[PDB]
Structure formats: C-alpha cells, structure tokens
C-alpha cells in the first residue's frame, strides 16, 4: 500500500517539479516565425542575426533569448499546421523587392511579387495571428534599385503613377504591403529595408519584440 | 488507372447486411460495454 504508492507519488512530484522548471525555462525564450516566398532572402536574414522538416535557430541579442523557426522546407498545406504557431511572439516576413520583374516558374503568368503579397495577406488575415505582429523585411534593396533604372515598376503595378526612382517605388511597395492589413487597430506591422551587409536588422527585431512583450505584460496586468 | 480498376474489381455487399451485422455486434457486446450501461462504483476503478 504505502511502500509503493508513496514512492510513486514522490516520483510524480519530482516529475512535476521538473516539468514546471522546463516550462518556465521554455517561457523565458521568445518564439519567432520566419516566412518567405521560397528565396525572398531568408538565408541572408538568418546568417545576419547570429552570434527536411522545421528548422529552429537560437540566438541571443541584448540578453534576450530568441527562438526563430523556419517552416519553408515543409512545402505542405499550411492550413493544417499553421495553428501550431498561435503563440509566437512575432512573425518575420521576408520579401525580395526584385520580385517585381520575375514571373513564377511554375506559373509563368503571375509575378513573384503578387505571390508574396497573397501570402502576406493570407498570413496577416489569419484568425490565429489576429494579435500577432509582423516584421516585414524588404530584402535586395541594392539589386532592386539597380533594376529600377532599367525595368519600370509598371510591369507588375499597372496602377502605379510615379517616377522611376528608388524612393518612390519603395514607398509604394511598402504602402501596398501595409494596406493588405485589415486589423490596423490591434495588429501593427514593422517594415524595414535590408541588405546583405547591414546589421541593424537585429536591433529592429529586438525593438519589435520589446514592444510586443510590453504589450503582453500590460494585457496580463489588465492595463492594456 | 490501375488503382481504380482494382477498387472496382473487388466485390461488394448490400448495405442492409452490413447494417444488420453492425447491429448484431452492438447487441452482443451491449452488456460488456461499461459506457452503454452504468457500472456499480465497486466495479468502477475510478471511485473518486
């Protein structure tokens, strides 16, 4: 009776202690979701913020433990596994500005920029990510600026009415990507232009995560 | 093509016979099912 049941209860109590410790340790880390249109520059972002199934990358910045998850290798219906990331802190979205002059190889009719915009709209308007913020990275700034001097932007934006300059084209792209967001009151989008040499992306992600965690703490305290 | 003709070649049975077999199975194991009929607390291992 006692000699076995009480030993089992002690084992269960030790298991409970270990489980609570592991849960706290996991809660210490910040979870991030990385998305992109195949080759929008995810590899660059990954190798920048650093000190076959899902790929998890751990990196620490300003004493804050990050846990970024890359799901591009799944190549399966996102609808059946997108709900797993309901609790991620923020979403890092990568888009290559050069996608305006490239057509999808599998389609040959739709531009890569349109596919990226569709994916961004699907992710933003997702019911699971209603409160999750998005960090939009517009990669390939230099290559996009170089190409704009030769290929007009109207190839993929027939409604575009502006000069063929980097500033106006980038502003138009950012406004288009931000307009897709419907819940502009609860959700906030942080847009930033990046290259292969700039390292300020980590500080941008850190600021976004700090804002998100401050909002979460205010909500938990009942202030927000 | 092969899988389709294979599924088509396999025989089939009337729905009424399968339903009667299901009903007979449920009736036979009625007493054995602890969820269908309530079980006394003494036999129930989940006392409290």
């Amino acid at each position: 009776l006692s000699a076995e049941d009480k030993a089992a209860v002690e084992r269960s109590k030790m298991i409970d202690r270990n489980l609570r410790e592991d849960g706290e340790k996991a809660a210490r880390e910040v979870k991030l979701l990385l998305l992109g249109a195949g080759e929008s520059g995810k590899s660059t972002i990954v190798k920048q913020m650093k000190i076959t199934g899902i790929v998890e990358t751990h990196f620490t910045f300003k004493d804050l433990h990050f846990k970024m998850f890359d799901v591009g290798a799944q190549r399966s219906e996102r609808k059946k596994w997108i709900h797993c990331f309901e609790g991620v802190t923020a979403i890092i979205f990568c888009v290559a500005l050069s996608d305006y002059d490239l057509v999808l190889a599998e389609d040959e009719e739709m531009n890569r920029m349109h596919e990226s915009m569709k994916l961004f709209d699907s992710i933003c308007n997702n019911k699971w990510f209603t409160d999750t913020s998005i960090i939009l990275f517009l990669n390939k700034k230099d290559l996009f600026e170089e190409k704009i001097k030769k290929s007009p932007l109207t190839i993929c934006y027939p409604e575009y009415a502006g000069s063929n300059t980097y500033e106006e084209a980038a502003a138009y792209i950012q406004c288009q990507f931000e307009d897709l967001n419907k819940r502009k009151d609860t959700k906030e989008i942080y847009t930033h232009f990046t290259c292969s040499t700039d390292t300020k992306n980590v500080q941008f992600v850190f600021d976004a995560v700090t804002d998100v965690i401050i909002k979460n703490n205010l909500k938990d305290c009942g202030l927000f | 093509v092969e899988q389709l003709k294979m599924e088509a070649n396999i025989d089939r049975i009337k729905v009424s016979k399968a339903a009667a077999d299901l009903m007979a199975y449920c009736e036979a194991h009625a007493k054995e099912d602890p969820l269908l009929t309530p079980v006394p607390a003494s036999e129930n291992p989940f006392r409290e």
């Binding site: 049941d5 089992a8 209860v9 084992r11 269960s12 298991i15 409970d16 489980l19 609570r20 592991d22 849960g23 996991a26 076959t52 199934g53 899902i54 799901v71 799944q74 190549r75 399966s76 219906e77 609808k79 059946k80 596994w81 797993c84 309901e86 | 899988q3 389709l4 003709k5 294979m6 599924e7 088509a8 396999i10 089939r12 049975i13 009337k14 729905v15 009424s16 016979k17 399968a18 339903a19 077999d21 299901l22 009903m23 199975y25 449920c26 009736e27 036979a28 194991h29 009625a30 054995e32 099912d33 602890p34 969820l35 269908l36 309530p38 079980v39 129930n44 291992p45 989940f46 409290e48």
Partner: protein, 328 residues
C-alpha cells in the same frame, strides 16, 4: 467512366439506409458522463494521446515538448520524456507497452523504449524519409510501425532496420489521420483530398476509396468489428463507412454546430460513437441512430484528442487547455 461505374455499383448496394432498419432498436437513454480524474501535468496545447492495452496507462503529447505516461487510476506520472522536437502532433503506445512513438512537424519519427536497463527512456531509433510533417502513426507490432505524413504518402517501417518496408502512395492531398484494424492486417487513412482509402499492410495496394466527405478528413477510427470505420472532417460532419458495403452508411451532423471535428473514437461495443468537436466540447453519438446521446463540456479550449480504453471502462479526452479528463 470507371467512376460512374463505381457510383452505380455503390448505389445498387444501397438497398436501404440502415436508419430504417435500426428503427426497431430503441434509442439509448441520455447518459451524463462525469469527470473522474483531472490530469494537470502538461502546460501547452495537447495534440495527441493513446491508451495502453492494459487500460491503465496512457501517453499524451503536448506542444511544449513533453511525453507524459499517466496512471489513469492514481494520476501518478510514470515517465516524462523530453522531446527532441517540440512541434509534436502525434503519439502512439505500443501494444506490448515496450515502446512509444512520436513525431510532428519534424519529419523524423521517434521511437522511445520504456523498459530500459538504465531506467531512463531513450530513443530506440529515429525514422526519417518523409518530406512532409508526420500527421499520425500507430504501432503495428513491437518491431513494425505504420506512419502517415502530410506529403501525400504513408509508410510502413521496420524499427529494427529503420527502412520503409512498404510505401503507400495515391493520396492527392495532405494525409491527416490513420487507424489500424483489429485484425492488424488492414489500416485506413484519410487525407485533405476529402477521401479515405483502405490499404493492405503487406500487399501495399489500395483496396477501396471513399469520397463522401466535403472537406479535409481530420480524424479516423476503425469500428471494433474491423469492417467499418468513422471519419471526422472539417465540414463538421462525421460519416460511417463499411468496407464490405463500400458505401457511406450514416452521416452524423447537426445544424447548430458548424465547426469541424478533430477526433473520433468508438466504444468497445461500438454502439457509442464519440467525436471531439472544435466547439470547446465533445459530443457522444449513437452509431446506429446518429443522435446526441451526451455532451462533454468540461474542457475550456478546443478538444484535440480522444480515445476509449481497450475494455471501454473509461474515456480520455485532451484539449488545448493542457488538461486531460477521464470520463466514465
């Protein structure tokens, strides 16, 4: 052409809907299942659980990355395994109680040995080869395990050698659930193509295919007789299929409820068909009449897993609230 032929054959098979013949059977009185044990070990959203052949121990997997083998009677925790991949959505309990399977977004399927000499649960072998996420897996034997993955394919593995002895292909969408038949010679699998297929364990050929559902199949369970199985779909309807009849028998649906189904299970006698819905509750259906026998509203979040003991002594239902409740 062949599709219309199969349709005509199945229509000719439908001599009469069993709802007519089952009228003689009196409807079972409504039963109120009360919770007995509340398991509060997990901390994240639970995704899958499996009962043991002894009807005593049950394994549960949570997104936090922990496998917990619960003693259903005393509530004690038998083992706590730290998962290598926290994104788990499927787990199984071997029939002999010697091994436990696990997997999820990580295409690798992990087999854990419980009866080790060191006393610590260690990975027996890592099974790789799937390009998509592991959706469901079940132990065919102490050395053979069947698996289903989102990459439109299922596979049977040999835990000793670690290679696919047989690969099942033919699904036109993501494979979601899998169920082994009692005879252990057949298994059924449902996918996102709104269809379910019966596969041979050794021949590897698709015996039959069913297309009665309107949306993705979320759950699948074999009737204890082995000749029938139920299927849960996102369209908020559960359907009963029979292999001999090769046709849909009954459709369990209701107007007020519109959200899809996540889990389905049968009692030992098969009279009671339990289905875990996405409405933060679970429903009990009469397999012979398709009526709301009971409703389980103990869980606060979406119900994720459901399973009845081998003897039907009790029912286990997990949810995203990190709590597993036993009912009987």
């Amino acid at each position: 052409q062949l599709k219309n032929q199969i349709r005509d054959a199945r229509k000719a098979c439908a001599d009469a809907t069993l709802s007519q013949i089952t009228n003689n059977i009196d409807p079972v009185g409504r039963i109120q299942m009360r919770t007995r044990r509340t398991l509060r070990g997990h901390l994240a959203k639970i995704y899958a659980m499996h009962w043991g052949t002894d009807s005593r121990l049950l394994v549960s997997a949570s997104q936090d990355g922990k496998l917990i083998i619960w003693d259903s009677y005393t509530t004690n925790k038998v083992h706590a395994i730290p998962l290598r991949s926290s994104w788990v959505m499927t787990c199984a309990y071997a029939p002999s109680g010697n091994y436990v399977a696990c997997g999820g977004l990580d295409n690798i399927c992990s087999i854990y040995n419980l009866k080790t000499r060191e006393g610590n649960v260690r990975v027996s072998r890592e099974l790789a080869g799937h390009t998509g996420y592991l959706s469901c897996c079940r132990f065919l034997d102490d050395n053979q395990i069947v698996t289903s993955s989102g990459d439109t394919t299922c596979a049977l593995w040999d835990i000793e050698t670690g290679q696919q002895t047989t690969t099942f292909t033919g699904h036109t969408g993501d494979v979601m659930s899998l169920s082994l038949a009692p005879d252990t010679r057949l298994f059924v699998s449902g996918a996102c193509d709104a269809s379910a297929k019966l596969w041979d364990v050794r021949e590897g050929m698709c015996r039959q295919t069913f297309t009665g559902h309107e949306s993705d199949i979320n759950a699948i369970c074999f009737f204890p007789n082995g000749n029938a199985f139920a299927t849960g779909s996102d369209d908020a309807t559960c359907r009963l299929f029979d292999l001999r009849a090769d046709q849909e028998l009954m459709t369990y649906s209701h107007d007020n409820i519109i959200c899809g189904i996540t889990s389905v299970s049968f009692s030992k006698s098969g009279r009671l068909l339990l289905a875990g819905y996405d409405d933060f509750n679970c429903n009990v259906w009469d397999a012979l009449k398709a009526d709301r026998a009971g409703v389980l509203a103990g869980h606060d979040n979406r119900v994720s897993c459901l399973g009845v003991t081998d003897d039907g002594m009790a029912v286990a239902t997990g949810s995203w609230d990190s709590f597993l409740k036993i009912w009987n």
